[PDB]
Amino acid sequence: SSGLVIRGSHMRIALMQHTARPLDPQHNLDLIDDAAARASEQGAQLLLTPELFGFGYVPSQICAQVSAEQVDAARSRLRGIARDRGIALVWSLPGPEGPEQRGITAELADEHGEVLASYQKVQLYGPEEKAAFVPGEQPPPVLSWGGRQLSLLVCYDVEFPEMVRAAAARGAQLVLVPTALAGDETSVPGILLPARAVENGITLAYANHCGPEGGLVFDGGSVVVGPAGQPLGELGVEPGLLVVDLPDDYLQDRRAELHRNWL
Amino acid sequence: SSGLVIRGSHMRIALMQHTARPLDPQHNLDLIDDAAARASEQGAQLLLTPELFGFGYVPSQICAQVSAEQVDAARSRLRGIARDRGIALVWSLPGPEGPEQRGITAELADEHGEVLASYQKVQLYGPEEKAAFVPGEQPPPVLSWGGRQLSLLVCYDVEFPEMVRAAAARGAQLVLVPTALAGDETSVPGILLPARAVENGITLAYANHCGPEGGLVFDGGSVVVGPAGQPLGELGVEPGLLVVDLPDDYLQDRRAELHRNWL
Known part of the structure; x- marks a missing residue:
């Protein structure tokens, strides 16, 4: 449990780990609102929440049943949560286009x-995701927030070293990843995140x-990993709100000009 | 310890882990010859040996003191060892050009x-290596041997996901890495190899x-890691001959055409 803000840390972040109810955004967004309040009370400045949490992780049903207007309404409620609980918030919804044109964002x-940054998942996972969403085509955004450079990726993205390298090449120091x-x-x-x-x-x-949730069983295991590959904090399989204080040459040495020809 | 060749394995490899004496190729090549004999007696078909073992890991002294003729003579002795002990052999020497033009191979x-394949280390480690050798410019080779596709990289190379991905993109299934x-x-x-x-x-x-050796203290920790990231065999810090039987979709899913623009 977090404690007083520690000397030599100036950023405290929180991660929401929970089950969502498919197709029930009232329930799921109330859950994010609850976590945002609890994170704020514990002195966190940002809350990271999981992939497609608002509608639950049900790609085919989102494609078939969830309209652009319904997505927009949840987006509006989330913006309201960040404002009303006074905490930066990272969430993941379908994109804003029609059901057959939008991706996971x-x-x-x-x-x-x-909203300071938006990113569309580039690496879609499995046939159901590829049937329900359009892959993103843009590199991950990187931006100053709270004293360092933040970036975004989504779930399967992080399993490709190329995606994390793309963020780090643009200056990212802290990469925040909604997952399912x-x-x-x-x-x-256990193996890939520490290496990234x-x-x-x-x-x-x-x-x-x-x-x-939605026919699957989610692993939990939410985690913050630091630059030495060690967990700064982690959850097991039970629902929880993980709160972590962040403390205050591969990227130069890599021969990028050769690498880009060899992929 | 190895045992009879197991049912459902058709490739047994060996890895030599030992200290080398700087600037003493007679001693060091006798050590490789001894290991090659022992590996062959244990039914291994290939022996992998460490980076720059023949002259010891002493970059500045190799540059200043070791001639192209001396390198060629060790190369010849190694070819003779593979032949006379009847075992495929992977070694690592300076390249064949003059001291100011050659790399680590x-x-x-x-x-x-x-000799079936030769590869020049692309990612040089630290100022001493970069002062003593020229970086390679070619992707890792991949070739059929013993029933699968083999490739080569050297030491620091393997720490770049791009280098291993370059081998795997060309079809590599088993990547052999002399290291120091x-x-x-x-x-x-502990972290990077399992992820690669x-x-x-x-x-x-x-x-x-x-x-x-040569002013440094080497870690040992020679290891063979399988596709699930688990060690099939490993050594600690003491000298040893590790012998491992090998048993009988990121690469498709990766959006390489986007990745190559984002590095």
Whole structure:
């Protein structure tokens, strides 16, 4: 448990790990609102929440049943949560276009409810995601917030070293990743995340669902990994609000001009 | 310890982990010859040996004192070892050009003493290596041997996901890596190697020096990691001959055409 803000840390972040109810945005957004309040009371300045949490992780049903107007309304409620609980908020909804044109996105809003960055998931996972969404085509955004450079990726993205390297090449120091990882994929948090942190010298935070949802069983295992590859904090399979204080040469040495020809 | 060749394995490899004496190729090549004999007696078909073992890991002294003729003579002795001990052999010497033009290389010779592949280290580590050698400019080779596709990288190369991805993109299934890792860099074998295996679905074998050598202290920790990221065999800090039987979709999903623009 967090404590007084520590000497030599100036950024405290929180990660929401919980089950969502498919197709029930009232319930799911109330859950994000509750977590945002609790995170703010514990002195966190940012809350990271999981992939597609607002509608639950149900790609085919989002495609078939969730309108652009319904997506927009949840987006508006989330902006309202960041503002009314006074905390930066990173969430993940379908994009704003029609059901057959939109992707999976993540957005960061500041403690005023204003969206600072939006990113569209580039690496879609499995046939259901690829059937329900259009892959993104743009590199991850990087922006100054709270004293360092933040970036966004979504779930399967982080499993490609190229995606994390793309953020780090643009200056990212802290990469925030809404996720929905099911099926006891231990190698992702256990093996891949630590390497993505070490091999770029960066911190990543990964906020998952947990528990029965939409036919799948989510792993939980939300975690913040620092540049040495070690967890600064982590959850197991139970729902929880993880709160972590962040403390105050591969990227130069890599022969990028050769690498880009060899992929 | 190895045992009878197991049902459902058809490739047994060996990794030599030992200290080298700087500037004493008679001593060091006799050590490789001894290991090659022992590996062959244990039924291994290939022996992997460490980076710059023949002259010891002493970049500045190789540059200043070791002639192209001396390098060629060690190369000839190594070819003779592969032939006379009847075992494929992967070694690492300076390249064949003059001291100011050559790089660090790795070569694979078959059990007849014929060199099948040569590769020049692309990612040089630290100011001493960059002062003593020219970086390679070519992607890692990939070739059929013993029933699968083999490739070569050297030491620091493997710490760049781009280098391993370059081999895997050309079809590599088993990547063999002469190394010289000193200074208790646990994150390399502990964190990076398992990820390089998982994120490409490949096996890597990493053969290090161990013990006091040329001013440094080598970690040992030679290891073979399989596609799930788990060690199939490993050594600690003491000298040893590691013998491992190998048993009988990131690479498709990666959006390479976007990634190459984002590095």
